Coordinates of C-alpha atoms in Angstrom, one line a residue:
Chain A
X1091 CA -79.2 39.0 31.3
X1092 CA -75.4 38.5 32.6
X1093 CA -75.9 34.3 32.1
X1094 CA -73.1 33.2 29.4
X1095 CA -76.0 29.8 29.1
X1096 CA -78.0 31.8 26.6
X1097 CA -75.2 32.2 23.8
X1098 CA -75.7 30.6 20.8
X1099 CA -73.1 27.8 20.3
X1100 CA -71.5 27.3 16.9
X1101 CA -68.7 25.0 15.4
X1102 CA -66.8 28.0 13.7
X1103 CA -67.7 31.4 13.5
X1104 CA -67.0 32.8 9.7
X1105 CA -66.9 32.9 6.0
X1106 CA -70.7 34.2 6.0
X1107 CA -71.6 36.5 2.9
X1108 CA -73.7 39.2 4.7
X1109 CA -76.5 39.2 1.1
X1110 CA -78.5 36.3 2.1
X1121 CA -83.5 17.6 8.3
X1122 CA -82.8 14.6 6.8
X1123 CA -80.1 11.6 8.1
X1124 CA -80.0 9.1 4.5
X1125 CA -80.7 11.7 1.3
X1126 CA -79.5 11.1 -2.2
X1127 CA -78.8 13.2 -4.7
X1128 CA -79.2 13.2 -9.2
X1129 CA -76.9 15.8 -10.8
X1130 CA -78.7 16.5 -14.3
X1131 CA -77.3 18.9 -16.9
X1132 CA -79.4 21.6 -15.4
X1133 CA -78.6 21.4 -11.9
X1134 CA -78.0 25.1 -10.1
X1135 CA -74.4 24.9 -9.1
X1136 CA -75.3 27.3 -5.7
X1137 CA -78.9 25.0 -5.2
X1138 CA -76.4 22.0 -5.7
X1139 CA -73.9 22.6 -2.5
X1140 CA -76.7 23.8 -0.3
X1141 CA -78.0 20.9 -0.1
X1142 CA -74.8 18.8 0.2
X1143 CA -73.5 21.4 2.9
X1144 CA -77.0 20.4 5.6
X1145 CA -78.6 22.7 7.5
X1146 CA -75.9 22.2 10.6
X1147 CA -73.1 24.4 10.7
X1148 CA -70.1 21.6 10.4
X1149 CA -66.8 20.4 8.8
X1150 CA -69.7 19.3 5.8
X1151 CA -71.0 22.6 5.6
X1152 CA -67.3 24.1 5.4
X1153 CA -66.0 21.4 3.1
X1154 CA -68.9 22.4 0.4
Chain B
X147 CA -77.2 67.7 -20.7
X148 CA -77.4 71.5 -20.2
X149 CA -79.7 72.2 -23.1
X150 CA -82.2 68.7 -22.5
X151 CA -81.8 69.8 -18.5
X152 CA -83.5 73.4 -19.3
X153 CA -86.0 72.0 -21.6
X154 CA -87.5 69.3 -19.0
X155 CA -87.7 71.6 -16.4
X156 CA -88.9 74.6 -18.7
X157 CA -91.7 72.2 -19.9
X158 CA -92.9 70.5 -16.4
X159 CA -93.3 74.7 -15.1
X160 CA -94.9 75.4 -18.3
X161 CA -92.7 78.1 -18.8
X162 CA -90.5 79.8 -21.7
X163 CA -87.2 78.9 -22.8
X164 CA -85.3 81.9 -21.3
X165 CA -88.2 82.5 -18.3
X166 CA -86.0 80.2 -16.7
X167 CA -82.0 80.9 -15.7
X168 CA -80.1 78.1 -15.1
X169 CA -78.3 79.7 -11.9
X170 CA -81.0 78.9 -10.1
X171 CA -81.9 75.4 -7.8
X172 CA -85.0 73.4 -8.4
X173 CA -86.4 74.2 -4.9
X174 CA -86.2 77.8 -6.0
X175 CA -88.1 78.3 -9.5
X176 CA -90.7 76.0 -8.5
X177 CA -93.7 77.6 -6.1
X178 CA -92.0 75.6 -3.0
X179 CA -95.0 73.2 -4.8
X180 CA -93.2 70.1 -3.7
X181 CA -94.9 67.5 -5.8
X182 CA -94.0 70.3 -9.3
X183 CA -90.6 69.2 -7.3
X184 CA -90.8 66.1 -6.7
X185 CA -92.2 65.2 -10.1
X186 CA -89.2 67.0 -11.7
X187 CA -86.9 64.7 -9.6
X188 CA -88.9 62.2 -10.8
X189 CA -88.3 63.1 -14.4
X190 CA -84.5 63.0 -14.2
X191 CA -84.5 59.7 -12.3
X192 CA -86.3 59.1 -15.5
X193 CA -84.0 61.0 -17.8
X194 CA -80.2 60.6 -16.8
X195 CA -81.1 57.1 -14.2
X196 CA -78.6 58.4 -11.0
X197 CA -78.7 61.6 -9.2
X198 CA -76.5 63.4 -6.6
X199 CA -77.7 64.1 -3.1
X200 CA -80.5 67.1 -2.5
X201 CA -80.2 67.7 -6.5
X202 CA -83.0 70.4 -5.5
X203 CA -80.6 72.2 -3.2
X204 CA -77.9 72.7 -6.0
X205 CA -78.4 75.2 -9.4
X206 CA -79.3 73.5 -12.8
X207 CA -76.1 75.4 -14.0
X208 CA -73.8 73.8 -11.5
X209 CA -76.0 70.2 -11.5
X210 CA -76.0 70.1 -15.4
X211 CA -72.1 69.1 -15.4
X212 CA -72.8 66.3 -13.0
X213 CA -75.4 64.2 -15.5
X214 CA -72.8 65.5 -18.6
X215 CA -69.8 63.3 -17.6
X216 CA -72.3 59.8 -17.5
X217 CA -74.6 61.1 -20.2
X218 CA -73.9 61.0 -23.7
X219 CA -76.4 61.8 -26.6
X220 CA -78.9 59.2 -26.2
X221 CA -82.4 60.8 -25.1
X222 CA -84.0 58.0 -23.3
X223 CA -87.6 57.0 -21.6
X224 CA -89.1 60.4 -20.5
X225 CA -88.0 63.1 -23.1
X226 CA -88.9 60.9 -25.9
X227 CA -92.2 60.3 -24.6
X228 CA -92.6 64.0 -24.5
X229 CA -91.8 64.5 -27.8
X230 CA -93.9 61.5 -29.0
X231 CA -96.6 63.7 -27.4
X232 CA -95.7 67.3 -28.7
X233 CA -96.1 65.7 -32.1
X234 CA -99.0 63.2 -32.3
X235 CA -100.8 65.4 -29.6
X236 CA -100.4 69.1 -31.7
X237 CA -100.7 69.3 -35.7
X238 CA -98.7 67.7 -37.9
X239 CA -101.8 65.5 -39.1
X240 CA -100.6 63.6 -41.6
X241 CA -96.4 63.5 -41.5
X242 CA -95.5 61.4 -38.1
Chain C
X514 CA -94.3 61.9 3.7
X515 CA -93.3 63.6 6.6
X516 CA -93.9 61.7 9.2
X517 CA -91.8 58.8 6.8
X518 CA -88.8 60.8 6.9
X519 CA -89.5 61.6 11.0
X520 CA -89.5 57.6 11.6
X521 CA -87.6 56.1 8.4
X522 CA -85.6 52.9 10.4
X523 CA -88.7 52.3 12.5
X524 CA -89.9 49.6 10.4
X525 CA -92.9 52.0 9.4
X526 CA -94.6 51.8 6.3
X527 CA -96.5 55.2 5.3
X528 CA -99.1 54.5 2.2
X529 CA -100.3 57.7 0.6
X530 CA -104.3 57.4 -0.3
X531 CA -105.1 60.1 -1.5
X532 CA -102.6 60.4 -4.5
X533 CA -101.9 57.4 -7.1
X534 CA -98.5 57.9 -8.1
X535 CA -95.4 55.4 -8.2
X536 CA -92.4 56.0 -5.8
X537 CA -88.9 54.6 -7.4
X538 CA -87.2 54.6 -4.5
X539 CA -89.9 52.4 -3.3
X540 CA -89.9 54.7 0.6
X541 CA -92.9 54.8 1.2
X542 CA -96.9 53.8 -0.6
X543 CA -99.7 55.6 -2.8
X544 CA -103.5 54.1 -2.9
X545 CA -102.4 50.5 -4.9
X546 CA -100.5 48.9 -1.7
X547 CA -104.0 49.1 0.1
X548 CA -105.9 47.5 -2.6
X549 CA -103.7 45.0 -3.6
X550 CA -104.5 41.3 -4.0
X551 CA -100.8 40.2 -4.6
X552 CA -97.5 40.2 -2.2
X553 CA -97.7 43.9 -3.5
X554 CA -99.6 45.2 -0.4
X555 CA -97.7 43.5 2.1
X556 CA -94.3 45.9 1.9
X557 CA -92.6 46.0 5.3
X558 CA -90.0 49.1 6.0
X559 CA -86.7 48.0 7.5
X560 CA -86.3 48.6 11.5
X561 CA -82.2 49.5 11.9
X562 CA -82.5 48.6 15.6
X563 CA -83.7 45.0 14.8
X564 CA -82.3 44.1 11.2
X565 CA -78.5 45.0 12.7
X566 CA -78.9 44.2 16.1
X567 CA -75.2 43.5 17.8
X568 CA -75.5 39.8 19.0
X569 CA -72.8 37.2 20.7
X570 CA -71.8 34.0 19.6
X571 CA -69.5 30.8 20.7
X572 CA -67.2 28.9 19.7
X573 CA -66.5 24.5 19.7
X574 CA -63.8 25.8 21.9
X575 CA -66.0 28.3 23.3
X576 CA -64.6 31.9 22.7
X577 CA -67.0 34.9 22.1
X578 CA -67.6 37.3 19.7
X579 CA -69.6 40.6 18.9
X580 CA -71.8 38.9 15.7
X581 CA -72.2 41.7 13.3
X582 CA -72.5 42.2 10.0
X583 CA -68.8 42.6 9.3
X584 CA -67.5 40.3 11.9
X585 CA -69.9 37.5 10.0
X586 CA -67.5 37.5 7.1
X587 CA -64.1 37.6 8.6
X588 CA -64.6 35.3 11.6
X589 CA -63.0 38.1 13.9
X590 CA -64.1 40.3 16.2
X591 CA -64.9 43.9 14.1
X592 CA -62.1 45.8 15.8
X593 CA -59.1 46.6 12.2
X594 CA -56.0 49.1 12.9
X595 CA -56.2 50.7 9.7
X596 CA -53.5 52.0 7.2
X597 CA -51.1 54.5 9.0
X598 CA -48.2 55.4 7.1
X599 CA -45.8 55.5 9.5
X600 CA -47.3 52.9 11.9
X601 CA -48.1 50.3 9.9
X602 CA -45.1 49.9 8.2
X603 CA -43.0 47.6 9.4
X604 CA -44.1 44.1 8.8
X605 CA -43.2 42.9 12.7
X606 CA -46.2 45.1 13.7
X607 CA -48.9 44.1 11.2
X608 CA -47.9 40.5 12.0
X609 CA -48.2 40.4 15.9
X610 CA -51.8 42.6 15.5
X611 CA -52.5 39.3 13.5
X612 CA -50.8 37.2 16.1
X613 CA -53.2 38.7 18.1
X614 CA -56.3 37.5 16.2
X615 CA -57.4 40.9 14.5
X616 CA -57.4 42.3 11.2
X617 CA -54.9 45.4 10.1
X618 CA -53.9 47.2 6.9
X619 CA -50.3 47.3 5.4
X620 CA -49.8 50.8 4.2
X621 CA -47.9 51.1 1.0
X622 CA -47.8 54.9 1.7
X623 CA -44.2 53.9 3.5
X624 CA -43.3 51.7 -0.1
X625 CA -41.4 52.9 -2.9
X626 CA -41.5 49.7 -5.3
X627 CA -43.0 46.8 -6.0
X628 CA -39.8 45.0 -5.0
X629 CA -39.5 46.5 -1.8
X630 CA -43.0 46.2 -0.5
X631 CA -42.5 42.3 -2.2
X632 CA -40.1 41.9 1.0
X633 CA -41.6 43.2 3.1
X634 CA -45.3 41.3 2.3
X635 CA -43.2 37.7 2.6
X636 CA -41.9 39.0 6.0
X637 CA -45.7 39.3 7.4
X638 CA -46.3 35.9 6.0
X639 CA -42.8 34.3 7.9
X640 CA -44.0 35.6 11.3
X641 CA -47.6 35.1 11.5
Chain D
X771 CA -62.1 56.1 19.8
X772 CA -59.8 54.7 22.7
X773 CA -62.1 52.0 24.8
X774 CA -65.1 49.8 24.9
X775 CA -67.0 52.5 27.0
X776 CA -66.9 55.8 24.0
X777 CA -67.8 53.2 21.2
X778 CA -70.4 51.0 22.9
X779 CA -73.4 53.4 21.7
X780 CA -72.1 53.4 18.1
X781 CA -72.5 49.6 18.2
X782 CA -75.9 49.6 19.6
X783 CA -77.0 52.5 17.7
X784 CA -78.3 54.3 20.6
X785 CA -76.1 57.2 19.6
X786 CA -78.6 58.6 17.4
X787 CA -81.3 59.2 20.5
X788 CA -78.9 62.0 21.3
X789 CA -79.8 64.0 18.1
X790 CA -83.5 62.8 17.9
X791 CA -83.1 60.1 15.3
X792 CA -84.4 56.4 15.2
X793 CA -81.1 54.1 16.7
X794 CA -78.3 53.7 14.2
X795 CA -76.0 50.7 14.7
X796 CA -72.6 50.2 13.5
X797 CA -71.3 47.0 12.2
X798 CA -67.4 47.5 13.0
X799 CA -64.9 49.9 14.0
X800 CA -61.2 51.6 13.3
X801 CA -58.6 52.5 15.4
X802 CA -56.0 54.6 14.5
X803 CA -53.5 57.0 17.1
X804 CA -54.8 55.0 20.1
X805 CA -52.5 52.1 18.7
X806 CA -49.5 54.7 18.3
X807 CA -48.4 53.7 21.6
X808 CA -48.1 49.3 21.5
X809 CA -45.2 47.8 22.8
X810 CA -44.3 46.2 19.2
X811 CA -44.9 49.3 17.2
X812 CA -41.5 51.0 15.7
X813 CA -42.5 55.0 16.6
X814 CA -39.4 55.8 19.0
X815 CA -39.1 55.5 23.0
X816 CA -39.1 59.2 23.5
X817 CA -41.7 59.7 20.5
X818 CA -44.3 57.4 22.6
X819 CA -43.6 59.7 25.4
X820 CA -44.7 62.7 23.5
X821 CA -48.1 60.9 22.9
X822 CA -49.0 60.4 26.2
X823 CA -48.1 63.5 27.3
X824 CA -50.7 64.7 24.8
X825 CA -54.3 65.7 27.2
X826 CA -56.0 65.6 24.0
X827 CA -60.0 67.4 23.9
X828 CA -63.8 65.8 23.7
X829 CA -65.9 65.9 20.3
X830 CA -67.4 69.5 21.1
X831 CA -64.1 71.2 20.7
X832 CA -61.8 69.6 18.4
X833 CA -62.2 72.6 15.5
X834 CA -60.3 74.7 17.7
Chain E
X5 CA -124.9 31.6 -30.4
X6 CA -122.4 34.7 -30.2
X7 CA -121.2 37.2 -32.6
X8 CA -117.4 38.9 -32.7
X9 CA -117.3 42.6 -32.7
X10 CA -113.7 44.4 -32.8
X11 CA -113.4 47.4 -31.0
X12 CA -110.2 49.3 -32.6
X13 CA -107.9 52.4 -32.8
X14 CA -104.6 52.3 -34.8
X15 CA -102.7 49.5 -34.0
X16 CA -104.4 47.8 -30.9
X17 CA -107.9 46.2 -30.8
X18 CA -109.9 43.9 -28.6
X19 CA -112.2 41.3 -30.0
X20 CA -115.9 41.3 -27.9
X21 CA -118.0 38.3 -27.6
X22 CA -121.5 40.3 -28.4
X23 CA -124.6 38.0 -28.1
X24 CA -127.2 38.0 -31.3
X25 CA -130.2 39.0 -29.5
X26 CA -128.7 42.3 -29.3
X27 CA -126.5 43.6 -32.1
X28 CA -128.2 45.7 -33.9
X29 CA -127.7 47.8 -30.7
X30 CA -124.0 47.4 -30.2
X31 CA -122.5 47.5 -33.2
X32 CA -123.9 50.9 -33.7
X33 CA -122.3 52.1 -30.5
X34 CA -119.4 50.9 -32.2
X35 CA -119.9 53.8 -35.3
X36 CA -120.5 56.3 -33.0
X37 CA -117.6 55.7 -30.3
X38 CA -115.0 55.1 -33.6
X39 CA -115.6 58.7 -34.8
X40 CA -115.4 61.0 -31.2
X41 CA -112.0 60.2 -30.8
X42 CA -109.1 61.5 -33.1
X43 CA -106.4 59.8 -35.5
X44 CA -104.1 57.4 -34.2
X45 CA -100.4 59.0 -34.3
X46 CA -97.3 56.3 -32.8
X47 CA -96.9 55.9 -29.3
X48 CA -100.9 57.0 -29.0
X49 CA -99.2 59.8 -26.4
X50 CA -102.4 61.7 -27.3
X51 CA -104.5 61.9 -23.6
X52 CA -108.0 61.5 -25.2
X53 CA -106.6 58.2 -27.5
X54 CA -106.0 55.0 -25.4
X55 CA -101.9 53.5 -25.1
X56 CA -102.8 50.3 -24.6
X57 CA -106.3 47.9 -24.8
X58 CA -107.2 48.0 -20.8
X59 CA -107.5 52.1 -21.9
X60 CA -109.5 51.2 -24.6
X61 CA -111.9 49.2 -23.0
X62 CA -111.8 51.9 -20.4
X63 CA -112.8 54.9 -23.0
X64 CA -115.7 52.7 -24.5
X65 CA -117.7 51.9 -20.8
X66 CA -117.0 55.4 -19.8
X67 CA -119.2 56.9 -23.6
X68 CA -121.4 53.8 -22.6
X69 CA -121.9 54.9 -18.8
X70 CA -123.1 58.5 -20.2
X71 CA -125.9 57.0 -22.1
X72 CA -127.4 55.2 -19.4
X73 CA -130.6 56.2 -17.0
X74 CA -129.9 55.1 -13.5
X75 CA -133.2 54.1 -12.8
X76 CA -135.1 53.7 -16.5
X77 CA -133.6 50.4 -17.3
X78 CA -132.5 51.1 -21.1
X79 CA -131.4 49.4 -24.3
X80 CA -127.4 49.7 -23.0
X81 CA -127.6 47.8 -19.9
X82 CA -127.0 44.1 -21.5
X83 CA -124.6 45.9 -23.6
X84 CA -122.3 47.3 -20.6
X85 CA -122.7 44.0 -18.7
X86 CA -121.1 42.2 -21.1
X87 CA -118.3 44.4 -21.5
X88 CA -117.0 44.8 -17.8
X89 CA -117.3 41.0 -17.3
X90 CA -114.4 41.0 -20.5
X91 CA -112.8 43.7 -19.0
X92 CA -113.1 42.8 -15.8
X93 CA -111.5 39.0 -16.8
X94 CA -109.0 39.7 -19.7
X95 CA -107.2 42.9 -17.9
X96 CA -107.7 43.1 -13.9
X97 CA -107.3 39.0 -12.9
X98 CA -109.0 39.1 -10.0
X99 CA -107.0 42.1 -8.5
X100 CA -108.2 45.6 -8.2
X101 CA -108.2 48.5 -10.7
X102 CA -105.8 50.3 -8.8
X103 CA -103.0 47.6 -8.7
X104 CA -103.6 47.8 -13.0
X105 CA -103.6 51.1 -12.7
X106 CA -100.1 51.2 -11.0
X107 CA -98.7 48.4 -14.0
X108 CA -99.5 50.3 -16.7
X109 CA -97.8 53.7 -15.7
X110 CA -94.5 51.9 -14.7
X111 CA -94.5 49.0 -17.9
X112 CA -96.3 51.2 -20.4
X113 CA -95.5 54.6 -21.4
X114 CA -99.1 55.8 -19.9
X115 CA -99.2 59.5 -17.6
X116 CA -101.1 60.4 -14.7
X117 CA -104.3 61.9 -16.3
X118 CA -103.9 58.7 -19.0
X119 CA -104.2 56.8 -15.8
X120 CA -107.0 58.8 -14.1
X121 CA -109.2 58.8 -16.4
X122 CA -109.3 54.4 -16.4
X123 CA -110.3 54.2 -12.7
X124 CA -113.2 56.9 -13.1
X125 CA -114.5 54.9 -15.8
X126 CA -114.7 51.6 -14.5
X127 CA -115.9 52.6 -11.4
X128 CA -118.9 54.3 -13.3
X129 CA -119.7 51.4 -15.4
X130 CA -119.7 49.5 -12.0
X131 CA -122.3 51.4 -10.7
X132 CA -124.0 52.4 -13.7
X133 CA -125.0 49.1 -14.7
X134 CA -125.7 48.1 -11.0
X135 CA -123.2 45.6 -9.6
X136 CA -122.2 48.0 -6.3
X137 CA -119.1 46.3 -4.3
X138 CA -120.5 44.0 -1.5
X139 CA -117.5 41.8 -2.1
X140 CA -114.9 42.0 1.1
X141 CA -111.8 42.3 -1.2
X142 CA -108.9 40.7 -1.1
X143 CA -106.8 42.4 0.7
X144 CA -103.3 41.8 0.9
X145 CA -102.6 44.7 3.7
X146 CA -105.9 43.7 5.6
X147 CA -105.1 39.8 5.4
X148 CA -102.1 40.7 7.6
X149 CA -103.8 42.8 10.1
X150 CA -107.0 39.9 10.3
X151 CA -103.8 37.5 10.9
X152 CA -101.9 39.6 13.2
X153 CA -99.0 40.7 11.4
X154 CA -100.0 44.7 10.8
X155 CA -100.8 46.9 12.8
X156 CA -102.8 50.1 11.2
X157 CA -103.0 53.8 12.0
X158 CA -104.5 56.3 9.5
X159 CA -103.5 60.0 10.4
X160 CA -105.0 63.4 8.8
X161 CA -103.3 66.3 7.6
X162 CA -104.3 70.1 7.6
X163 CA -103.9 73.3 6.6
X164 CA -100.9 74.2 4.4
X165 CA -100.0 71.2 2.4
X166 CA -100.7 72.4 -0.8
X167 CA -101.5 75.9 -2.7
X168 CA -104.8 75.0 -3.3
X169 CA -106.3 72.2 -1.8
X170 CA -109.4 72.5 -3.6
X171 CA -107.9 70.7 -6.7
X172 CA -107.7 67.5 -5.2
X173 CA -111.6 67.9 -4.0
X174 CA -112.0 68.6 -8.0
X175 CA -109.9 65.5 -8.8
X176 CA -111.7 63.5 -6.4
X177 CA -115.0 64.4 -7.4
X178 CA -114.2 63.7 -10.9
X179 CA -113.2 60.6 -10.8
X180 CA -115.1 59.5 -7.7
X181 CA -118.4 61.1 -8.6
X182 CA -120.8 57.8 -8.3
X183 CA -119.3 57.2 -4.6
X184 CA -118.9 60.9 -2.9
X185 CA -121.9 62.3 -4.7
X186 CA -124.0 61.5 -1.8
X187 CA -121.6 62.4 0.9
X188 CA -120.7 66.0 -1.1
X189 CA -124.2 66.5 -1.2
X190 CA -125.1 66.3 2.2
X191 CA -122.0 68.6 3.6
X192 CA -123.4 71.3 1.1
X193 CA -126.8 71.0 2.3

């Protein structure tokens, strides 16, 4: 509807495969531990420099 | 894959081993039945796992070389389950 | 059946009751999916127009792009100059369509040896 | 392709009304002798002049 | 105070919890239904033997549905009972008889007409010994139209679809024939 307002805004746009709130967490790596399930949660649900780093 | 190709459509038309030529496309020796056709395509999805594109548009002659380049000897789910039939269902009653 | 193929894309799901049979391409139903107790029943068809939708996007620094599919992965705009023998040759070419901020294809068709083409690869990576 | 305005219905996928089909979208797209003629590409000055010079023919014709 | 009886063919069996009271009854049954049906041979490919033990559950209700009097109530009816609510807790979980018919044609190495002949015999043992369905099923499909996530149209076909049509009003009368045989009925009258 011509308004450039209604864009979502995003850090960085990129390095998304095309297959697929909480502010003091901690985390226990055990032996089991799925290495994918693992960074997910380190990454957070905000696209960031976290969710890049991870 | 030429000889087990004949034999699974020969059976599924309830037909004779030479009734059928093998120049000839699926569409065309079945009664433009459509589930007979589809239930043949359903066999060698069954049989050989992938098929090419309309496989009932091209002859058994010509789409017999296709499955013989990723098929090698080993009969698999549906042609063994026909001959578990054929055996157990008719009359050898005592030797399995 | 034939009203599936007629609207296949639509997001349409077409369930067969009359016939129990099993479909392994999984297109369209037979009498089960109606019956169903399990998450078994509840099979939704794809709509093209909705699962690939093109969309736009910003950036921090607030540049746009046309969010597809493709462009997702690369983090550029979906816009490549392919491999053309002649054309993309040279590596001053493939660099400034870099410089430019999209995506092209070295063509080794104008190569001879993996020396040669060696060169010319670390020349792209010099410039841009 | 040569422009946003011949390629915009691929990307929607509005295309496919044309020939009675649900829409079709496309997810990216190539560009090949439109780029012939860049500033910074090596095919010669009177080579680029030969291009352009070239009328070229829509989609219903090409065959000929 | 229970008894075990094993109904069996080759090299699958199911165990049935028959009460004392009646016994004498049942196991009887079992001699009769053990003999009908012929020699096991691997794979049990053989369309009147059962492939697996939902099957052979099925074949016994279906010999035990024949013997029954709709209205007389009989000797069989405590013995029926008692073998759809096994049946009906071992082998179908709740779901419906279509969703195990689907499983056992795509796990198994069951056919169409192996298949067939399961949901004609349950549904005749349902009726048979009278427990009609006044249940509102659990739908997966009609949960999400009650929520408001489907949306349902049912169309009708005609003319030309198959060679013979009438086939399918055989099939269906077959295996449906304690549900259409009033509707049938009343369009030939």
């Amino acid at each position: 509807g011509d308004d450039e307002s209604k864009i979502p805004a995003v850090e960085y746009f990129g390095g998304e495969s095309p297959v697929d709130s909480e502010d003091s967490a901690v985390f226990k790596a055990t032996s089991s531990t799925d290495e994918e399930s693992w960074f997910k949660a380190l990454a957070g649900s905000e696209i960031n420099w976290r969710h890049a780093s991870f | 894959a030429s000889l087990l190709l004949h034999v699974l459509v020969a059976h599924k038309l309830k037909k004779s081993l030479d009734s059928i030529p093998m120049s000839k496309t699926i569409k065309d020796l079945v009664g433009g039945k459509s589930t007979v056709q589809n239930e043949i395509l359903g066999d060698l999805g069954k049989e050989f796992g992938t098929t090419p594109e309309k496989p009932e548009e091209t002859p058994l002659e010509e789409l017999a070389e296709t499955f013989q380049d990723t098929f090698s000897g080993a009969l698999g789910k549906q042609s063994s389950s026909l001959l578990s039939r054929l055996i157990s269902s008719k009359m050898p009653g005592g030797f399995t | 059946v034939l009203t599936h193929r007629n609207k296949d894309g639509t997001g349409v799901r077409v369930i067969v009751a009359g016939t129990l049979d099993i479909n392994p391409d999984d297109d369209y139903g037979f009498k089960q999916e109606i019956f169903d107790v399990t998450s078994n029943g509840l099979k939704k068809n794809p709509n093209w127009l909705e699962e690939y939708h093109p969309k736009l996007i910003k950036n921090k620094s607030g540049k746009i792009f046309v969010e597809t599919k493709f462009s997702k992965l690369i983090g550029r705009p979906p816009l490549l100059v392919p491999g053309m023998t002649p054309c993309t040759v040279s590596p001053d070419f493939v660099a400034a369509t870099t410089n430019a901020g999209y995506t092209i294809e070295l063509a080794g068709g104008g190569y001879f040896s993996a020396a040669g083409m060696t060169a010319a690869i670390d020349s792209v990576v010099s410039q841009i | 392709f040569g422009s946003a305005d011949d390629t915009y219905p691929y990307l929607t996928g509005e295309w496919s009304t044309k020939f009675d089909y649900p829409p079709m979208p496309f997810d990216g797209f190539l560009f090949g002798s439109r780029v012939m003629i860049a500033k910074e590409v090596k095919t010669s000055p009177d080579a680029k002049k030969c291009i352009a010079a070239c009328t070229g023919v829509p989609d219903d014709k090409w065959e000929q | 105070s229970t008894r075990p009886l094993t109904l069996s063919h080759g090299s699958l069996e199911h165990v049935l919890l028959v009460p004392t009271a009646s016994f004498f009854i049942a196991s009887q049954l079992q001699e009769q239904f053990n003999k009908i049906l012929p020699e096991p041979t691997e794979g049990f490919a053989a369309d009147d033997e059962p492939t697996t033990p939902a099957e052979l559950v099925g074949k016994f209700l279906g010999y035990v549905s024949s013997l029954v009097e709709p209205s007389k109530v009989g000797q069989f009816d405590q013995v029926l009972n008692l073998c759809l609510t096994e049946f009906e807790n071992c082998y179908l979980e709740g779901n419906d008889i279509h969703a195990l018919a689907a499983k056992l044609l795509q796990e198994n190495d069951t056919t169409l007409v192996k298949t067939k002949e399961l949901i004609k015999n349950y549904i005749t043992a349902r009726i048979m010994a009278k427990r009609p369905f006044d249940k509102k099923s659990n739908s997966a499909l009609f949960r999400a139209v009650g929520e408001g996530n489907a949306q349902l149209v049912a169309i009708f076909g005609g003319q030309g679809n198959t060679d013979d049509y009438f086939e399918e009003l055989r099939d269906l009368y077959q295996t449906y024939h304690v549900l259409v045989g009033d509707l049938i009925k009343f369009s030939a009258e």
